[PDB]
Short mmCIF file of all heavy atoms in Angstrom, two decimals:
data_model
loop_
_atom_site.label_atom_id
_atom_site.label_comp_id
_atom_site.label_asym_id
_atom_site.label_seq_id
_atom_site.Cartn_x
_atom_site.Cartn_y
_atom_site.Cartn_z
N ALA T 30 -7.30 -8.14 -16.08
CA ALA T 30 -6.80 -9.27 -16.84
C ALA T 30 -5.35 -9.07 -17.22
O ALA T 30 -4.98 -8.05 -17.81
CB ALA T 30 -7.64 -9.46 -18.10
N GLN T 31 -4.51 -10.02 -16.85
CA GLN T 31 -3.11 -10.00 -17.26
C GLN T 31 -2.93 -10.80 -18.54
O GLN T 31 -1.81 -11.15 -18.93
CB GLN T 31 -2.23 -10.54 -16.14
CG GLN T 31 -2.15 -9.62 -14.93
CD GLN T 31 -1.22 -8.46 -15.18
OE1 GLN T 31 -0.04 -8.51 -14.85
NE2 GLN T 31 -1.75 -7.42 -15.80
N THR T 32 -4.05 -11.10 -19.16
CA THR T 32 -4.10 -11.77 -20.46
C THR T 32 -5.16 -11.07 -21.31
O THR T 32 -6.18 -10.66 -20.78
CB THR T 32 -4.44 -13.27 -20.28
OG1 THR T 32 -3.52 -13.87 -19.37
CG2 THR T 32 -4.40 -14.01 -21.61
N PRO T 33 -4.94 -10.89 -22.63
CA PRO T 33 -3.74 -11.34 -23.36
C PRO T 33 -2.43 -10.67 -22.91
O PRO T 33 -1.42 -11.35 -22.73
CB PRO T 33 -4.05 -10.97 -24.82
CG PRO T 33 -5.13 -9.95 -24.76
CD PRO T 33 -5.92 -10.25 -23.53
N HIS T 34 -2.45 -9.36 -22.72
CA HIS T 34 -1.22 -8.62 -22.45
C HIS T 34 -0.92 -8.54 -20.96
O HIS T 34 -1.74 -8.08 -20.17
CB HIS T 34 -1.29 -7.21 -23.06
CG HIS T 34 -1.29 -7.19 -24.57
ND1 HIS T 34 -0.36 -7.87 -25.33
CD2 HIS T 34 -2.11 -6.57 -25.44
CE1 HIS T 34 -0.61 -7.66 -26.61
NE2 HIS T 34 -1.67 -6.88 -26.71
N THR T 35 0.27 -9.00 -20.58
CA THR T 35 0.71 -8.98 -19.18
C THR T 35 1.21 -7.58 -18.78
O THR T 35 2.40 -7.31 -18.73
CB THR T 35 1.80 -10.05 -18.93
OG1 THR T 35 2.39 -9.88 -17.63
CG2 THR T 35 2.89 -10.01 -20.00
N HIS T 36 0.25 -6.71 -18.52
CA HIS T 36 0.53 -5.29 -18.26
C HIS T 36 0.68 -4.99 -16.78
O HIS T 36 0.07 -5.65 -15.95
CB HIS T 36 -0.59 -4.43 -18.84
CG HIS T 36 -1.94 -4.80 -18.31
ND1 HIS T 36 -2.59 -4.10 -17.32
CD2 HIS T 36 -2.77 -5.81 -18.65
CE1 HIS T 36 -3.75 -4.66 -17.07
NE2 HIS T 36 -3.89 -5.70 -17.86
N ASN T 37 1.44 -3.97 -16.44
CA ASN T 37 1.56 -3.56 -15.04
C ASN T 37 0.65 -2.38 -14.73
O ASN T 37 0.86 -1.67 -13.76
CB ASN T 37 3.00 -3.22 -14.69
CG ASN T 37 3.92 -4.43 -14.74
OD1 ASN T 37 4.03 -5.17 -13.76
ND2 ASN T 37 4.58 -4.64 -15.86
N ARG T 38 -0.36 -2.17 -15.57
CA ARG T 38 -1.39 -1.19 -15.27
C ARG T 38 -2.68 -1.89 -14.87
O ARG T 38 -3.57 -2.07 -15.70
CB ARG T 38 -1.67 -0.24 -16.45
CG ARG T 38 -0.62 0.85 -16.65
CD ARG T 38 0.64 0.31 -17.29
NE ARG T 38 1.74 1.27 -17.27
CZ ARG T 38 2.94 1.03 -16.74
NH1 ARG T 38 3.20 -0.13 -16.16
NH2 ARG T 38 3.88 1.96 -16.79
N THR T 39 -2.75 -2.31 -13.62
CA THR T 39 -3.91 -3.02 -13.11
C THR T 39 -4.52 -2.21 -11.98
O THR T 39 -3.86 -1.33 -11.43
CB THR T 39 -3.50 -4.42 -12.59
OG1 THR T 39 -2.50 -4.29 -11.57
CG2 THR T 39 -2.97 -5.29 -13.72
N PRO T 40 -5.79 -2.46 -11.63
CA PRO T 40 -6.46 -1.76 -10.53
C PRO T 40 -5.80 -2.02 -9.17
O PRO T 40 -6.19 -1.45 -8.16
CB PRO T 40 -7.89 -2.29 -10.54
CG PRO T 40 -7.88 -3.50 -11.41
CD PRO T 40 -6.69 -3.40 -12.32
N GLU T 41 -4.80 -2.91 -9.16
CA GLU T 41 -3.99 -3.15 -7.97
C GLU T 41 -2.72 -2.30 -8.02
O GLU T 41 -2.01 -2.16 -7.03
CB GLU T 41 -3.61 -4.62 -7.89
CG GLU T 41 -4.81 -5.55 -7.78
CD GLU T 41 -4.39 -7.00 -7.64
OE1 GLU T 41 -3.91 -7.38 -6.56
OE2 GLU T 41 -4.55 -7.76 -8.62
N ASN T 42 -2.45 -1.74 -9.19
CA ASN T 42 -1.25 -0.95 -9.43
C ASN T 42 -1.58 0.52 -9.54
O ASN T 42 -0.82 1.39 -9.10
CB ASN T 42 -0.55 -1.43 -10.70
CG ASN T 42 0.25 -2.72 -10.51
OD1 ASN T 42 -0.11 -3.57 -9.69
ND2 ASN T 42 1.32 -2.86 -11.26
N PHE T 43 -2.73 0.80 -10.12
CA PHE T 43 -3.19 2.17 -10.30
C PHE T 43 -4.64 2.30 -9.87
O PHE T 43 -5.52 2.58 -10.68
CB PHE T 43 -3.05 2.60 -11.76
CG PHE T 43 -1.63 2.60 -12.28
CD1 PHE T 43 -1.06 1.43 -12.75
CD2 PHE T 43 -0.89 3.76 -12.30
CE1 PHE T 43 0.24 1.42 -13.22
CE2 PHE T 43 0.41 3.76 -12.77
CZ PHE T 43 0.97 2.59 -13.24
N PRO T 44 -4.92 2.09 -8.57
CA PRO T 44 -6.29 2.13 -8.05
C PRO T 44 -6.87 3.54 -8.13
O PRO T 44 -8.07 3.72 -8.33
CB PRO T 44 -6.14 1.69 -6.58
CG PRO T 44 -4.78 1.10 -6.48
CD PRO T 44 -3.95 1.80 -7.51
N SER T 45 -6.00 4.53 -8.01
CA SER T 45 -6.40 5.92 -8.00
C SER T 45 -6.64 6.43 -9.43
O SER T 45 -6.87 7.62 -9.65
CB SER T 45 -5.33 6.76 -7.30
OG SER T 45 -5.80 8.06 -6.99
N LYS T 46 -6.58 5.52 -10.39
CA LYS T 46 -6.83 5.86 -11.79
C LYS T 46 -8.08 5.16 -12.28
O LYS T 46 -8.48 5.28 -13.44
CB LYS T 46 -5.62 5.51 -12.67
CG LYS T 46 -4.39 6.36 -12.38
CD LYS T 46 -4.71 7.85 -12.47
CE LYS T 46 -3.50 8.71 -12.12
NZ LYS T 46 -3.86 10.14 -11.94
N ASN T 47 -8.68 4.43 -11.35
CA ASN T 47 -9.97 3.76 -11.53
C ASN T 47 -9.96 2.79 -12.70
O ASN T 47 -10.69 2.95 -13.66
CB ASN T 47 -11.10 4.78 -11.69
CG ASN T 47 -11.25 5.68 -10.47
OD1 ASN T 47 -11.85 6.75 -10.54
ND2 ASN T 47 -10.67 5.27 -9.35
N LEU T 48 -9.15 1.74 -12.59
CA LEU T 48 -9.07 0.73 -13.64
C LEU T 48 -10.27 -0.22 -13.56
O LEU T 48 -10.17 -1.37 -13.14
CB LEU T 48 -7.75 -0.03 -13.52
CG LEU T 48 -6.61 0.48 -14.42
CD1 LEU T 48 -6.90 1.88 -14.94
CD2 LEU T 48 -5.28 0.49 -13.67
N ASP T 49 -11.42 0.31 -13.97
CA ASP T 49 -12.69 -0.40 -13.92
C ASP T 49 -12.91 -1.22 -15.18
O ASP T 49 -12.83 -0.70 -16.29
CB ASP T 49 -13.84 0.60 -13.78
CG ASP T 49 -13.80 1.39 -12.49
OD1 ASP T 49 -13.91 0.77 -11.41
OD2 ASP T 49 -13.68 2.63 -12.56
N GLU T 50 -13.21 -2.50 -14.98
CA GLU T 50 -13.55 -3.41 -16.07
C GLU T 50 -12.49 -3.43 -17.17
O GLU T 50 -11.45 -4.07 -17.04
CB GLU T 50 -14.90 -3.03 -16.70
CG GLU T 50 -16.11 -3.38 -15.87
CD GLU T 50 -16.33 -4.87 -15.78
OE1 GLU T 50 -16.62 -5.49 -16.82
OE2 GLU T 50 -16.21 -5.43 -14.67
N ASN T 51 -12.78 -2.70 -18.24
CA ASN T 51 -11.91 -2.62 -19.40
C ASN T 51 -12.10 -1.26 -20.06
O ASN T 51 -11.75 -1.06 -21.22
CB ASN T 51 -12.21 -3.75 -20.40
CG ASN T 51 -13.62 -3.75 -20.98
OD1 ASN T 51 -13.82 -4.04 -22.15
ND2 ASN T 51 -14.62 -3.47 -20.15
N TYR T 52 -12.66 -0.34 -19.29
CA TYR T 52 -12.93 1.01 -19.76
C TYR T 52 -11.64 1.71 -20.16
O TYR T 52 -10.59 1.47 -19.57
CB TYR T 52 -13.60 1.83 -18.65
CG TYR T 52 -14.86 1.21 -18.11
CD1 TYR T 52 -15.43 1.67 -16.92
CD2 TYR T 52 -15.50 0.18 -18.78
CE1 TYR T 52 -16.59 1.11 -16.43
CE2 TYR T 52 -16.66 -0.38 -18.30
CZ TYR T 52 -17.20 0.09 -17.12
OH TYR T 52 -18.37 -0.46 -16.65
N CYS T 53 -11.73 2.56 -21.17
CA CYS T 53 -10.59 3.37 -21.58
C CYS T 53 -10.19 4.34 -20.49
O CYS T 53 -10.65 5.48 -20.45
CB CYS T 53 -10.93 4.14 -22.85
SG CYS T 53 -11.18 3.11 -24.32
N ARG T 54 -9.35 3.88 -19.59
CA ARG T 54 -8.84 4.70 -18.51
C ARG T 54 -7.49 5.28 -18.89
O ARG T 54 -7.01 5.07 -20.00
CB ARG T 54 -8.70 3.87 -17.23
CG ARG T 54 -10.03 3.41 -16.65
CD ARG T 54 -10.96 4.59 -16.37
NE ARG T 54 -12.07 4.23 -15.48
CZ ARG T 54 -13.11 5.01 -15.22
NH1 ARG T 54 -13.24 6.17 -15.85
NH2 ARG T 54 -14.01 4.65 -14.31
N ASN T 55 -6.89 6.02 -17.99
CA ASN T 55 -5.56 6.54 -18.21
C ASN T 55 -4.70 6.36 -16.96
O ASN T 55 -4.38 7.31 -16.26
CB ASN T 55 -5.64 8.02 -18.60
CG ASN T 55 -4.32 8.57 -19.12
OD1 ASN T 55 -3.27 7.93 -18.99
ND2 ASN T 55 -4.36 9.76 -19.69
N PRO T 56 -4.33 5.10 -16.65
CA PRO T 56 -3.51 4.78 -15.48
C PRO T 56 -2.06 5.23 -15.64
O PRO T 56 -1.51 5.90 -14.76
CB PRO T 56 -3.59 3.26 -15.38
CG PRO T 56 -3.94 2.78 -16.74
CD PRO T 56 -4.72 3.89 -17.40
N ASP T 57 -1.45 4.87 -16.76
CA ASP T 57 -0.05 5.20 -17.02
C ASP T 57 0.19 6.71 -17.05
O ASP T 57 1.22 7.19 -16.59
CB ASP T 57 0.40 4.59 -18.35
CG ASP T 57 1.89 4.74 -18.61
OD1 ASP T 57 2.30 5.77 -19.19
OD2 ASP T 57 2.65 3.83 -18.23
N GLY T 58 -0.79 7.44 -17.57
CA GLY T 58 -0.68 8.88 -17.66
C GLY T 58 -0.28 9.34 -19.04
O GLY T 58 0.78 9.94 -19.23
N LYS T 59 -1.13 9.06 -20.01
CA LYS T 59 -0.90 9.50 -21.37
C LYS T 59 -1.64 10.82 -21.61
O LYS T 59 -2.22 11.38 -20.68
CB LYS T 59 -1.38 8.45 -22.38
CG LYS T 59 -0.74 7.09 -22.20
CD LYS T 59 0.77 7.15 -22.33
CE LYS T 59 1.40 5.79 -22.12
NZ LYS T 59 2.88 5.85 -22.11
N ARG T 60 -1.63 11.30 -22.84
CA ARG T 60 -2.35 12.52 -23.19
C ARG T 60 -3.84 12.26 -23.31
O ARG T 60 -4.65 13.18 -23.24
CB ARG T 60 -1.81 13.08 -24.51
CG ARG T 60 -2.04 12.15 -25.69
CD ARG T 60 -1.31 12.62 -26.94
NE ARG T 60 -1.53 11.73 -28.08
CZ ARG T 60 -0.72 11.68 -29.14
NH1 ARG T 60 0.35 12.45 -29.20
NH2 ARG T 60 -0.99 10.84 -30.13
N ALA T 61 -4.20 10.99 -23.46
CA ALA T 61 -5.59 10.60 -23.67
C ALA T 61 -5.84 9.20 -23.13
O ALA T 61 -4.89 8.45 -22.87
CB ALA T 61 -5.92 10.66 -25.16
N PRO T 62 -7.12 8.84 -22.91
CA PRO T 62 -7.52 7.50 -22.47
C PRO T 62 -6.95 6.41 -23.36
O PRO T 62 -6.89 6.57 -24.59
CB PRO T 62 -9.04 7.52 -22.59
CG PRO T 62 -9.40 8.94 -22.43
CD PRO T 62 -8.29 9.72 -23.08
#
């Protein structure tokens, strides 16, 4: 979802980070989910 927030962390941008549903993932690469 690019709504509400129009983020560039999408499963099309970070597929190898497993952006599934709305799960607390870590695509950007923070210290935590």
Side-chain angles (χ1 to χ4, degrees):
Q31 290 283 267
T32 305
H34 292 309
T35 170
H36 56 101
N37 293 274
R38 283 76 191 125
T39 58
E41 299 182 73
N42 282 31
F43 298 84
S45 193
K46 292 306 177 191
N47 299 161
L48 264 17
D49 296 298
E50 286 291 295
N51 61 142
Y52 305 166
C53 293
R54 293 303 197 189
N55 191 348
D57 187 271
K59 303 301 179 186
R60 63 189 180 201

